[PDB]
Amino acid sequence: MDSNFLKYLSTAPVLFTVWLSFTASFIIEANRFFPDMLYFPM
Amino acid sequence: KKVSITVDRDPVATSFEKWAQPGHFSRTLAKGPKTTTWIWNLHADVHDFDSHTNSLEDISRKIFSAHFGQLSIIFLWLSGMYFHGARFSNYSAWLSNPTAVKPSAQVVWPIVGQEILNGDVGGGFQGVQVTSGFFQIWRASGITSEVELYWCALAGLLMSGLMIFAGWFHYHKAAPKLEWFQNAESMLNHHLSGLLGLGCLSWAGHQIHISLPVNKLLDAGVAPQEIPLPHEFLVNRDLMAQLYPSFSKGLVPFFTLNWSEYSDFLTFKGGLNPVTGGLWLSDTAHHHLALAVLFIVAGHMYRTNWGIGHSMKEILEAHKGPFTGEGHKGLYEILTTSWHAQLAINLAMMGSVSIIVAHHMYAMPPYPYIATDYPTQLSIFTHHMWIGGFCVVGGAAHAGIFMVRDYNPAQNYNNLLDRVIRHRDAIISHLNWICIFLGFHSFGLYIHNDTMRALGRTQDMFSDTAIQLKPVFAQWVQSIHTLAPGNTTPNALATASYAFGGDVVAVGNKVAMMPISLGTADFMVHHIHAFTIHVTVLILLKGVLFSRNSRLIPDKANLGFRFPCDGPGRGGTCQSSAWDSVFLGLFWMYNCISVVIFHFSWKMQSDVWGTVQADGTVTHITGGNFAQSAITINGWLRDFLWAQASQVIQSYGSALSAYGLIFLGAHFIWAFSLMFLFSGRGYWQELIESIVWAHNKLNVAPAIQPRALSITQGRAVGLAHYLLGGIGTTWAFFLARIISVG
Amino acid sequence: VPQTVAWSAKTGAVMVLSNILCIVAGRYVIQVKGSFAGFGLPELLASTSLGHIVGSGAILGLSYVGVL
Amino acid sequence: DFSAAVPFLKRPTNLDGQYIGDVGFDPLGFSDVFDLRVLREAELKHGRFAMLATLGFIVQELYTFPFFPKMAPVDAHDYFVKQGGGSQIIFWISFVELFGVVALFETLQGKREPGDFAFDPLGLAKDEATLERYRLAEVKHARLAMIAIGGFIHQYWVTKQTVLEQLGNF
Amino acid sequence: MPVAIPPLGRPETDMFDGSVPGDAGFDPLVISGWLDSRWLREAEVKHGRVAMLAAAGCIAQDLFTFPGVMSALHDAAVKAGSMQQMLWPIAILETISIAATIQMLQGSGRAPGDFGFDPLGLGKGAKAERMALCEIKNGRLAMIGFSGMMHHYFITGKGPIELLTS
Ligand code: CLA
Ligand code: CLA
Ligand code: CLA
Ligand code: CLA
Ligand code: CLA
Ligand SMILES: CC1=C(C#C\C(C)=C/C=C\C(C)=C\C=C\C=C(C)\C=C\C=C(/C)C#CC2=C(C)C[C@@H](O)CC2(C)C)C(C)(C)C[C@H](O)C1
Ligand SMILES: CC1=C(C#C/C(C)=C/C=C/C(C)=C/C=C/C=C(C)/C=C/C=C(C)/C=C/C2=C(C)CCCC2(C)C)C(C)(C)C[C@H](O)C1
Ligand SMILES: CC1=C(C/C=C(\C)CCC[C@H](C)CCC[C@H](C)CCCC(C)C)C(=O)c2ccccc2C1=O
C-alpha cells in the first residue's frame, strides 16, 4: 500500500462516505434479519 | 505545416502525492485550512482552471482531459442503462405487447417495505416504471433480445474504459501543445465532416440495413423471436429484397444517380406510422443520410495545410458596415484565446437545441409506440426543457465570466463588443421598458379575467365566448403547414406533424397525435412565455454588460466576477456582481420553464391526449377544460394544480407512493432553501459564536474554526436547494399524475 | 416521387461539363494556392469534387423538370 | 536496435531483456504505458491458471473421483456452481489472492520479482542457470497453455466432445 | 534519370532522388508532393504482392484444384466459412503491419516493403536492388493482368487460361 494513497483514503470525505455506508449497512442488515422493531421486546 | 500535431511527453508524473494534499491546485489553498470556509473554497473553485495558473496550454490540457472524464462517465451511464435494461427489465414482454405493458427497468430490493414500489407493470413483471424512453429507442434500433442489450452494455463499458484511458494518456503521458488546441478551422472541418457527417452516415447505414427490415417485420405482426438476426439481413440480399425490392438492384442506382429506384426504403412520407404512432423510419433514414451529406460538404469549408478553404478571420473582418465601425474584427482572437467565450456560445447553442428537441419531439414522435406512452413524452419534454434553460443561463454566466476576466479593451477598440458596451444603457432601458409592457399587457389580462369572473361579469372577460384575442398569425401558419403537402411541398404524402391540422392518429385506442387548436388562452400563455423569456434576457444581459463597471461601481472588474458586494455604501451595493445576476436569472429561468411545462402538461392533457372510442369521438383526460379555465389564475389553481395533484397525494399505499414522499421532501427542501435565501451571514456567525462557546466549555472546540457560509455561498446554497425543491415537486407531481391517468 | 433516369451519354455529358466548368472556376477564384501554373492535386480534387456535386444537382434537377 | 523475434519491428524500449523469455514482442506498446512488473505478474498468473486448466482437462476426463458424478468439465462448472464446490474453490483462490495482492504490492516496490512466490519445496532449481532455464521453460509453457486452454474449451463448444475423443476420430 | 513524359518533366519531391527502386519519373498528378513517400511505396509494394498472389492463384486454380470440393468462389467460400478462416491470419498479420507502418512513419530504420524475410538468402548482397526492380515491375504487371482478367470473368464467366485455350 502506497502511503500517499492511504493518506488520500484517510481524508474526511472518503472516510465519511465509507463510515456512513458502513453504518447504513448495519442498519439495513439489522432491519433485514430483525424487521418491524417498533419496540424493545419484553 | 501550419496545422500539425505538437505534444509534450510525460508533462505530469502519475503519482498519488497530490491526492493526499487537498488544495494543491491553488497557492492560497495549499497552505491548508484554518477555517471551515477553506473547505467550501476548495470544492467551489477546483475546476476553475484559469484562476490557478496563467498558462493557457495547461488550462486547455486540463479542459481536454476533463472532457474525456465526462465522456467516460456518460459512457458508463449508458452502459448501465443497457445492462439494467438487459437484466432487470420487462423488455421482451413490452416488445410482444407495446400497448398494454408499462416499461420498467428498475427493481428494488425488499428491505423496509419499499418492495411495494415494485408495481404491477404488466408482462408478468414487477418493478419501478421508467419514463426515459429507452424501450422505444431499442425498438427503433432493432434490438429484439436482451443478449443484444448485454452486448451494448459491454460496449458501453469498454468505451468508458477507453475514454478514461484516453484522458489519462492525453493529460499525464502525451499532452497536446497550445498550438494544437488553437486550430479552429481544422477542428470545425473534422467535427463537421467526421463527427457529425460520418456519424450521420453510419447511423443512416444502420437504419437502412438493420432498423428498417426489423421494424417492418415488427409492424407486420411478427413475433420478435422469429425475426432474423441483423447479420442475416446483411448477407441475405434476397431476405432484404422481399421487404425492399430495390436492394435487388444493389449499389448501381446510387453511383449512376438513379436514386428514385431507392424510393421504397428512402421516403419522404411524413405524418406518422399508423401501426406505431411514430415517424416513418425510411423518412428518418433519408433525413440522416441527407444530414450526413450536408455535414460532410460543410466540413470542407475551412482553410487547412492545403491552399483550399475559407479563413474565418478574413470572413469576420470582411463583414463590416457603416453602422458598426470595425465590425466583427477581433472576435477570432477572442474565441481562439478565451475558453470562456467558447463555453458561453456552446452552452447557449446546446440549450437552444435542447429546447428545439423538446418541442420537435413532442410534436413529431420519432420512435415506435412513444406517442401513446404519455409519461415518456411528458418526462422527455420537461427534462430537455430544464436542461435547455440551465444551459442557456450557463452560457450567459460564462459570457459574464469572459467579460470580467478575459476581455481586453486594447484589442477591442471600436468593434461590435465595444459599441455594445457603449450603448448598454439604451439596450437595458428599452428591454426593461418592453419587459414592463409585456408584464402589464400579459399578466394583467389574467388578473383582469380573474376579477371579471369574480365580479360576475363573464361578458367582460378575455375569452372565446367574450372579447377575443385571437392568435391569427399562428393559426395562419398552421393553415399554411396543413396546406403544405402537395402545394408547397409536392413530394410529401402527409404533413410534417398533425399538430398543425389533419386527422387524429390513434394507436391502441389512445391518441398518438391530433390537431392542437390555439385560442385566447394559448395567446395569453404564449405572450406570458415571451414576457418571461424577455425578463430573463434582461437580467442576464444586464449582468453581462455591467459586469466590468457601472455608474455605481466604476471598478467592478477589479473586484472580480464573483463578489458579494462593495459594502453598504452608495446606499447599498448588494448583489452587484454578474454572478448575482446569474443567481436571479436562474430563478427566472425556473419560473419560465415551470410555466412552459405547466402549459404543456395542461394543453396535452386537455386537448391532445385521451382515449378514442366508438363513433370516433375523443375523450380527453381532463375533458377539454383548457379553453375556459386557463384564462384565469383561479382556473390554473383549481383545474390544473388542485385537480391533478389528487394522484400524488392519494398515492400512499400504492406503487407511486415514493413520488408522494419525494413530493413532500421537495416541499421540505425548497422551504429549507429560504432559510439561506432570506437570512444573512452576521446572525449565523454570532449564533456560531455561541455554539463555539458551548463547545469551548467542554473543551471540544475544533482546530478548524467554524465560520458561517459566505454571502455568495449563502445565495448559491439557497438557490441550489430552491431549484432542487421546485424541480423535484414538479417532477413528482407530473410523474405521479401522468403514470396514474396515462 | 421525382423521376430519375438510368445512366446514359446525356448524364455523362452533363457531369463532364460540370467538372470542366468547376475546374476553370476553381482556377479563377481560389485566392490561396502559364495559366495552369501552381495547379496542384488538392486544387484538382476540390474542383472535381465540386464538379461531381454540381453535376449531381444538375442531373437531378433536369430529370425532375423533364429535360433529362 | 530491432526486435529479435519480429525483425521489421523496432525493439520496445522497456523490453531490454531483464525478464527471461524477452524477444521484443509488443507491437501495441503495452509496456510503453503500463508497468512491466504488473504485466509479468498478470502473464504468469494467467499462464499458471491455463497450465492447471489444460492438465485438468486431460486428467479430469482420464480419471474422475468416485464421490462425484461423471460429466464434462464445461458442464462441471455449471454443476459445481449449484452443488457448492465451485464456491469453495473460488473462496480459497480469493484467500490466496489476498496475499497475492500483498505480493504484488511488494513487487511494485522492487523488493520482489514479478514471478517469485518463493515456492520450491522439492528444491528442483539448485543453482542459477537451471533456474534461468526453468524460467524460460515456464514462460514458454505458460504462453502455450494459454493458447491451448482456449483451444480445448472452444473445441468443446463447437464439437461437443472432449479432447481425447476428438483425437481418436478427426 | 528516366523521364517518362518529356513535356511535364521530373517531379521535385522526396521521391525520384534515384534511391527508390523502380522509379521511371512518372507522377503527372504529383501525388508524391502531398502524401508521404514511404507510405505510398509501402502501399504500392503491398498492392503488387497481393496482385501477384491473386494472379498466381487464378492461374493455379484454373490448372488444378486441391482434392475435396472467381467471385462466385468468394461467395461460396463465405458460405463455407473458408473466407473467415483466411480473414483471421491476414487480420492479425495486418495489425502487426499497422504497428510496423506506424513505427516506419515515426522514423524507424525499416525500408518500405521490407519485412526482414529472406530464408533462401537470395537477396543478401548485390542482388537485392535488381530483385526490387523485378518485384516492382512484376507487381505493376500483376495489377494490370488481374484487373483485366476479372472484368473478362465479368463478361464471360470463364477463366483466363481457359478462355485462352478455347
Ligand atoms: C474526424 C475526427 C474527429 C472526431 C470524430 C472527433 C470527435 C470528437 N471531438 Mg475532436 N478534434 C479533432 C478531430 C475529431 N474529433 C481534431 C482534428 C482536433 C484538433 C483541431 C480536435 C480537437 C478537439 C477538442 C479540443 C475537443 C474535441 C472533442 C471531441 C468530442 C466531442 C464530444 C462528443 O460529441 O462526443 C460524443 C461523440 C462520439 C463519437 C463518442 C465516441 C468518442 C470516440 C473518441 C469517437 C472515436 C471514433 C473513431 C475515430 C472511429 C471509430 C468508429 C468505428 C469505426 C468503430 C468528440 C468525440 C471535445 C471532447 O470532449 O474531448 C474529449 C473537446 O474538448 N475535439
Ligand atoms: C441544372 C440546374 C438545376 C436545376 C434546374 C435545379 C432545379 C431544382 N433543384 Mg437543384 N441544384 C443544382 C442545380 C439545379 N437545380 C445544383 C448545382 C445543386 C448543388 C448540388 C442543387 C442542389 C439542390 C438540392 C439540395 C435540392 C435541389 C432541389 C431542386 C428543385 C426545387 C424546386 C423548388 O421549388 O425549390 C424549392 C423552393 C423553396 C423556396 C423551398 C425552400 C427551401 C429551404 C427550406 C429554404 C431555406 C431558407 C433558409 C431558412 C435561409 C433563408 C433566410 C435568408 C434571409 C438568409 C428544382 C427542380 C430540391 C429537390 O430536389 O426537391 C425535390 C433540393 O432539395 N437542388
Ligand atoms: C458545459 C458545462 C459547464 C462547464 C464546463 C462549466 C465550467 C465552469 N463554471 Mg459553469 N455553469 C454551467 C455549466 C458549465 N460550467 C451552467 C449550466 C450554469 C448555470 C447553472 C453555470 C453557472 C456558473 C456560475 C454561476 C459559476 C460557474 C463557474 C464555473 C467554473 C468553475 C466551476 C467549479 O469549480 O465548480 C466546481 C464544482 C462544483 C461546485 C459542484 C457543483 C454541485 C452542484 C451545485 C450541485 C448539484 C446537485 C445535483 C445535480 C443534485 C443533487 C440532489 C440530491 C442530493 C437529492 C468553470 C470554468 C464559477 C466560476 O468561478 O467561474 C469562473 C461560477 O462562479 N458557472
Ligand atoms: C408574483 C410575484 C412577483 C411579481 C408580481 C414581480 C413583479 C416584477 N418583477 Mg419580480 N421577482 C419575484 C416575484 C415577483 N416579481 C421573485 C420571487 C424574484 C426572485 C428572484 C424576482 C426577481 C426579479 C428580478 C431579478 C427582476 C424582477 C422584475 C420585475 C418587474 C417586471 C416588470 C413587469 O412585469 O411589470 C408588470 C408588473 C406586474 C406583473 C406586477 C403586477 C401588476 C398587475 C398588472 C396589476 C396592476 C394593478 C394596479 C397597479 C393596482 C393599482 C391600485 C392602486 C391602489 C395602487 C415587476 C415589477 C424585473 C424588473 O424590474 O425589470 C423590469 C427584474 O429585473 N423581479
Ligand atoms: C511445467 C511448467 C512449469 C515450469 C517449468 C515451472 C518453473 C518454475 N516455477 Mg512454477 N508453476 C507452474 C508450472 C511451472 N513452473 C504452475 C502450473 C504453477 C501453479 C501451481 C506454478 C507455481 C509456482 C510458484 C508458486 C513458484 C514457482 C516457481 C518456479 C521456479 C522454480 C523452479 C522449480 O521448482 O520449477 C521446476 C518445476 C518442474 C521441474 C516441474 C515438475 C513437474 C512434475 C513432472 C510433476 C507434474 C505434475 C503431475 C503430472 C501431476 C500428478 C497427477 C497425476 C494424476 C498424474 C521455476 C522457474 C517458484 C519461483 O519462481 O521461485 C524460485 C515459485 O515460487 N512456480
Ligand atoms: C522474396 C522471397 C521469397 C519469395 C517469393 C515469392 C512468393 C515469389 C514470387 C511470387 C509471384 C506470385 C510472382 C509473380 C510474378 C509475375 C506474374 C504472376 C506475372 C503475370 C501475372 C499476370 C497478372 C498475368 C497474366 C495473364 C495471363 C496468363 C492470362 C490472362 O489474364 C492475360 C495475361 C497476359 C494478363 C521466398 C519465400 C522464396 C524466400 C526468399 O528468401 C525471399
Ligand atoms: C464462458 C464460460 C466458460 C468459459 C471459459 C473460458 C475458460 C474461456 C477461455 C478462453 C480462452 C482462454 C481463449 C483463448 C483464445 C486464444 C487465442 C484466440 C489465441 C490466439 C493466438 C494467436 C493468434 C497467435 C498468434 C501468433 C502465432 C501464431 C505465433 C507467433 C506469435 C503470434 C503472432 C502471437 C466455462 C467453461 C467456465 C463455462 C461457463 O458456463 C461459460
Ligand atoms: C443556516 C445558514 C448558515 C449556516 C450553515 C452552516 C455554517 C454550514 C452547515 C454545513 C454542515 C456542517 C455540513 C452538512 C450538515 C450535515 C447534515 C451534518 C454535518 C456532518 C458533520 C460531521 C460535518 C449560513 O452560514 C448562512 C450564510 C449566509 C446566508 C444564510 C445562511 C444560513 O441560512
Side-chain angles (χ1 to χ4, degrees):
Chain A
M1 277 306 179
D2 186 62
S3 77
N4 279 322
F5 184 63
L6 291 175
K7 186 179 289 293
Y8 159 73
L9 283 188
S10 297
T11 46
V14 180
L15 279 190
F16 206 52
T17 302
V18 162
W19 189 257
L20 285 185
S21 296
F22 170 65
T23 290
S25 305
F26 280 171
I27 305 159
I28 281 157
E29 297 273 49
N31 272 269
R32 173 152 84 91
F33 282 87
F34 316 106
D36 304 326
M37 284 300 87
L38 190 60
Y39 54 92
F40 183 83
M42 294 296 172
Chain B
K1 280 298 275 170
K2 288 187 85 63
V3 179
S4 53
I5 295 154
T6 46
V7 292
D8 274 301
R9 296 279 190 180
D10 298 290
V12 177
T14 312
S15 160
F16 278 128
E17 182 178 1
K18 293 171 155 58
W19 288 50
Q21 314 174 318
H24 58 85
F25 48 87
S26 170
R27 67 185 68 188
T28 60
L29 297 175
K31 293 182 183 293
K34 296 293 187 290
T35 63
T36 47
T37 314
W38 184 91
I39 296 154
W40 306 118
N41 293 352
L42 158 72
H43 284 68
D45 272 302
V46 56
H47 298 147
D48 198 8
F49 298 144
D50 50 304
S51 66
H52 310 146
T53 62
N54 48 341
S55 174
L56 195 53
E57 187 171 274
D58 309 338
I59 298 162
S60 300
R61 289 152 168 193
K62 289 173 197 285
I63 283 156
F64 191 58
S65 302
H67 290 180
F68 270 121
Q70 167 78 105
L71 286 187
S72 177
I73 288 174
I74 294 175
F75 273 118
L76 175 67
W77 168 73
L78 266 184
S79 160
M81 288 321 105
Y82 279 120
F83 193 87
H84 283 247
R87 166 78 175 82
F88 303 111
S89 86
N90 54 350
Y91 176 62
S92 299
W94 181 86
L95 271 178
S96 298
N97 207 8
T99 63
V101 171
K102 316 293 196 175
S104 164
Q106 202 186 312
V107 182
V108 310
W109 291 318
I111 180 62
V112 292
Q114 83 174 8
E115 68 273 16
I116 200 176
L117 301 186
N118 287 333
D120 316 307
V121 287
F125 192 75
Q126 297 203 141
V128 174
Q129 179 163 351
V130 292
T131 65
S132 60
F134 262 109
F135 277 27
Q136 291 91 352
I137 295 169
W138 304 336
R139 191 187 217 277
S141 309
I143 297 165
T144 58
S145 64
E146 293 83 3
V147 187
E148 290 156 311
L149 290 176
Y150 275 124
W151 282 105
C152 287
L154 180 59
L157 210 51
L158 287 181
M159 276 299 263
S160 177
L162 268 186
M163 287 322 82
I164 199 70
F165 174 74
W168 170 76
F169 187 82
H170 279 317
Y171 192 76
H172 288 284
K173 297 293 291 183
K177 288 193 208 263
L178 185 56
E179 293 83 3
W180 185 89
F181 287 103
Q182 291 185 313
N183 282 289
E185 281 92 346
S186 175
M187 207 186 294
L188 288 172
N189 277 357
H190 270 86
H191 285 175
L192 270 163
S193 56
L195 174 60
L196 303 181
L198 282 194
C200 283
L201 177 60
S202 48
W203 183 245
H206 191 99
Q207 273 187 128
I208 283 160
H209 287 291
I210 312 301
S211 293
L212 262 68
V214 173
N215 271 266
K216 190 166 181 122
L217 288 182
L218 274 169
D219 299 359
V222 188
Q225 293 82 17
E226 290 82 3
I227 291 175
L229 299 183
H231 63 262
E232 317 199 79
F233 285 120
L234 292 181
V235 291
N236 223 32
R237 293 179 66 188
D238 291 80
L239 183 63
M240 185 93 180
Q242 299 144 66
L243 303 155
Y244 306 101
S246 302
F247 267 78
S248 64
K249 286 163 186 34
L251 286 177
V252 187
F254 170 71
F255 287 105
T256 56
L257 294 174
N258 204 5
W259 290 357
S260 81
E261 303 295 327
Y262 297 148
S263 78
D264 51 354
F265 68 98
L266 300 170
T267 69
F268 183 75
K269 291 192 211 180
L272 297 173
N273 193 4
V275 182
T276 69
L279 292 179
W280 291 101
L281 284 196
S282 297
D283 297 350
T284 73
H286 197 193
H287 182 84
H288 274 117
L289 173 58
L291 283 178
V293 173
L294 199 61
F295 282 147
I296 293 161
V297 171
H300 283 83
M301 185 182 184
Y302 296 120
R303 191 173 292 144
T304 46
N305 292 329
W306 311 266
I308 53 179
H310 286 268
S311 168
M312 296 178 90
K313 184 178 184 293
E314 284 160 26
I315 292 178
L316 283 162
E317 286 172 350
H319 282 91
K320 46 168 282 174
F323 298 88
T324 43
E326 290 317 300
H328 289 80
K329 185 183 286 185
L331 309 177
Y332 187 80
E333 287 94 338
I334 278 176
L335 282 169
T336 47
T337 50
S338 182
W339 278 101
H340 284 293
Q342 287 277 351
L343 188 52
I345 296 184
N346 298 352
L347 268 172
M349 299 297 84
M350 284 297 261
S352 307
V353 159
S354 191
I355 285 150
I356 288 157
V357 159
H359 268 283
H360 287 174
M361 284 198 72
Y362 76 90
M364 320 174 257
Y367 297 107
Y369 302 104
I370 197 166
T372 51
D373 198 7
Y374 302 153
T376 294
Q377 287 278 270
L378 180 56
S379 291
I380 66 177
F381 184 87
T382 309
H383 179 84
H384 279 112
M385 269 294 147
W386 278 115
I387 294 306
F390 266 101
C391 287
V392 172
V393 180
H398 290 280
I401 290 154
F402 160 78
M403 266 303 276
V404 163
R405 305 189 162 180
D406 296 322
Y407 173 80
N408 196 250
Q411 285 141 33
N412 281 291
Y413 182 72
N414 211 36
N415 60 351
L416 302 159
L417 189 40
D418 179 54
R419 299 167 79 92
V420 159
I421 293 156
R422 276 168 29 218
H423 79 300
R424 67 189 175 179
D425 290 84
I427 298 180
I428 293 314
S429 62
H430 276 71
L431 184 55
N432 169 305
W433 163 74
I434 205 61
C435 285
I436 299 170
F437 166 74
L438 274 167
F440 285 159
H441 292 68
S442 65
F443 187 65
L445 307 185
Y446 284 89
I447 298 305
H448 179 108
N449 274 2
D450 272 298
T451 313
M452 289 307 139
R453 199 170 257 171
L455 291 160
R457 313 150 63 168
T458 57
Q459 77 279 341
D460 292 344
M461 291 177 66
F462 294 108
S463 71
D464 295 316
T465 59
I467 313 165
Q468 283 183 258
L469 313 162
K470 182 64 70 177
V472 291
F473 300 130
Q475 279 162 353
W476 184 62
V477 169
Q478 265 186 351
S479 87
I480 292 169
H481 290 164
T482 315
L483 287 166
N487 182 235
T488 58
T489 318
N491 302 325
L493 300 190
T495 183
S497 169
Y498 288 90
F500 296 126
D503 311 278
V504 185
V505 174
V507 167
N509 311 327
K510 310 193 62 52
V511 176
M513 188 84 249
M514 59 180 309
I516 314 184
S517 66
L518 304 156
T520 303
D522 304 274
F523 179 89
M524 294 156 69
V525 71
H526 266 88
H527 274 106
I528 283 294
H529 297 332
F531 153 69
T532 52
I533 295 170
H534 270 94
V535 172
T536 315
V537 164
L538 167 72
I539 304 154
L540 296 170
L541 187 58
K542 188 263 183 183
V544 162
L545 293 194
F546 290 94
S547 48
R548 290 194 62 85
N549 63 6
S550 54
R551 273 173 178 103
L552 197 60
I553 306 173
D555 52 353
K556 204 193 277 188
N558 288 358
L559 308 178
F561 165 75
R562 186 176 79 223
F563 60 95
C565 71
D566 206 16
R570 316 179 189 85
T573 53
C574 306
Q575 284 183 13
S576 277
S577 64
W579 187 95
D580 304 291
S581 78
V582 181
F583 156 81
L584 301 171
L586 271 158
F587 283 111
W588 264 87
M589 184 271 312
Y590 166 84
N591 195 47
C592 168
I593 302 297
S594 295
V595 173
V596 165
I597 65 190
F598 281 178
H599 174 209
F600 174 80
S601 184
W602 202 0
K603 185 73 178 179
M604 308 291 294
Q605 279 181 75
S606 160
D607 287 350
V608 188
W609 293 343
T611 75
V612 183
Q613 69 275 17
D615 297 336
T617 193
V618 170
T619 298
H620 296 113
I621 294 172
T622 74
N625 53 351
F626 190 85
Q628 277 307 307
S629 296
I631 55 180
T632 53
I633 308 298
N634 203 33
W636 278 93
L637 176 88
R638 167 195 64 248
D639 290 352
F640 182 65
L641 301 189
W642 181 89
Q644 307 191 8
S646 300
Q647 283 78 23
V648 71
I649 68 182
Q650 303 154 15
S651 66
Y652 269 32
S654 71
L656 301 191
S657 54
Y659 290 118
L661 295 170
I662 283 157
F663 201 59
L664 291 180
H667 283 99
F668 174 84
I669 197 64
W670 180 95
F672 184 75
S673 85
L674 311 178
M675 183 178 72
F676 297 93
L677 285 173
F678 294 170
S679 62
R681 213 193 84 81
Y683 175 85
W684 298 105
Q685 192 52 74
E686 301 164 315
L687 183 66
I688 276 163
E689 284 155 23
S690 286
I691 298 155
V692 161
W693 180 92
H695 285 80
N696 286 316
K697 188 67 176 165
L698 304 188
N699 211 16
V700 71
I704 293 187
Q705 293 188 80
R707 303 286 200 242
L709 312 169
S710 84
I711 312 160
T712 303
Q713 189 181 0
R715 290 161 191 164
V717 163
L719 173 60
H721 291 86
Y722 192 106
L723 288 174
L724 175 65
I727 290 161
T729 289
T730 316
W731 181 90
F733 156 67
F734 276 176
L735 270 178
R737 160 74 176 188
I738 200 58
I739 285 168
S740 277
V741 304
Chain C
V1 65
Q3 298 299 110
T4 71
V5 289
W7 189 93
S8 66
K10 293 180 182 178
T11 291
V14 192
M15 182 72 81
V16 170
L17 183 87
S18 296
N19 295 115
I20 295 169
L21 276 296
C22 291
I23 296 169
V24 192
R27 178 71 274 172
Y28 291 167
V29 306
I30 290 174
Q31 290 157 212
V32 179
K33 295 154 157 139
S35 312
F36 287 102
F39 189 75
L41 178 66
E43 193 176 290
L44 188 153
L45 277 180
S47 63
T48 301
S49 311
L50 191 65
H52 272 83
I53 276 173
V54 169
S56 307
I59 278 154
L60 276 296
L62 294 174
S63 66
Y64 182 76
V65 302
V67 184
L68 295 202
Chain D
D1 197 3
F2 284 81
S3 66
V6 182
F8 57 93
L9 272 177
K10 68 181 178 66
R11 195 210 66 210
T13 300
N14 300 119
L15 297 193
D16 291 331
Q18 65 183 357
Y19 292 118
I20 301 299
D22 183 16
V23 288
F25 176 61
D26 189 36
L28 277 296
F30 270 96
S31 58
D32 289 326
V33 298
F34 303 128
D35 198 347
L36 203 51
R37 292 164 302 186
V38 189
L39 292 172
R40 180 48 84 106
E41 181 65 26
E43 185 167 56
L44 278 174
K45 198 170 289 183
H46 270 87
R48 284 156 180 173
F49 268 121
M51 293 179 183
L52 292 174
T54 46
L55 189 54
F57 268 90
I58 302 305
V59 178
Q60 182 162 321
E61 182 65 26
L62 294 174
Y63 182 76
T64 300
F65 288 135
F67 42 82
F68 281 141
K70 298 177 183 177
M71 73 291 291
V74 170
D75 291 331
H77 178 271
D78 304 275
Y79 170 73
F80 279 92
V81 170
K82 298 293 183 182
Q83 184 249 303
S87 64
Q88 273 271 282
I89 295 172
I90 284 302
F91 159 71
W92 284 110
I93 288 169
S94 287
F95 181 69
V96 181
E97 273 285 88
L98 298 171
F99 317 117
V101 165
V102 185
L104 178 74
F105 281 145
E106 294 293 328
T107 299
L108 288 164
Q109 293 179 356
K111 292 177 71 68
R112 180 197 164 252
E113 297 294 325
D116 217 325
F117 273 109
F119 177 73
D120 203 10
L122 296 195
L124 295 179
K126 275 88 176 176
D127 52 353
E128 313 210 17
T130 183
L131 187 51
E132 307 297 328
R133 179 161 92 261
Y134 287 6
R135 292 180 179 91
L136 184 61
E138 186 176 47
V139 167
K140 285 183 180 179
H141 281 91
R143 301 163 167 171
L144 195 50
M146 266 172 300
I147 303 161
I149 186 52
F152 286 172
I153 310 191
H154 275 99
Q155 283 173 0
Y156 182 84
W157 273 332
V158 290
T159 72
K160 314 291 298 186
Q161 296 192 321
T162 293
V163 189
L164 277 296
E165 61 185 359
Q166 311 183 195
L167 294 174
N169 45 356
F170 56 85
Chain E
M1 294 182 286
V3 185
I5 61 170
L8 282 71
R10 182 157 199 119
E12 292 88 4
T13 53
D14 175 63
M15 293 180 183
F16 311 98
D17 46 320
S19 83
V20 175
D23 47 351
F26 180 59
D27 194 15
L29 304 175
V30 183
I31 311 178
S32 47
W34 304 105
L35 290 172
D36 211 14
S37 296
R38 299 164 295 186
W39 174 269
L40 286 163
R41 285 180 60 195
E42 175 72 29
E44 185 170 55
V45 176
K46 186 182 286 185
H47 268 83
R49 276 147 181 191
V50 169
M52 293 180 184
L53 281 173
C58 294
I59 293 289
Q61 289 171 65
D62 275 322
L63 271 295
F64 182 71
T65 76
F66 286 138
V69 303
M70 320 303 87
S71 306
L73 297 173
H74 184 284
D75 293 330
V78 169
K79 287 317 275 160
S82 172
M83 296 318 264
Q84 202 266 353
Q85 268 298 295
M86 283 74 74
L87 186 66
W88 161 68
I90 313 292
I92 190 166
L93 188 153
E94 273 283 85
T95 47
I96 303 292
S97 87
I98 278 179
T101 300
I102 282 173
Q103 294 189 350
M104 180 269 288
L105 285 178
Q106 273 177 357
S108 69
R110 176 180 161 279
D114 173 349
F115 281 164
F117 181 76
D118 206 0
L120 277 296
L122 301 172
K124 312 162 172 164
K127 307 246 183 176
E129 277 87 4
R130 197 220 179 252
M131 292 180 183
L133 188 43
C134 297
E135 192 168 58
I136 191 166
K137 288 185 75 183
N138 286 257
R140 285 148 186 191
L141 189 152
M143 320 162 171
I144 301 299
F146 176 76
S147 74
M149 66 182 180
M150 294 298 103
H151 274 86
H152 276 291
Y153 165 74
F154 289 154
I155 62 170
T156 58
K158 290 309 287 150
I161 210 69
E162 200 182 16
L163 273 168
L164 194 55
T165 178
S166 305

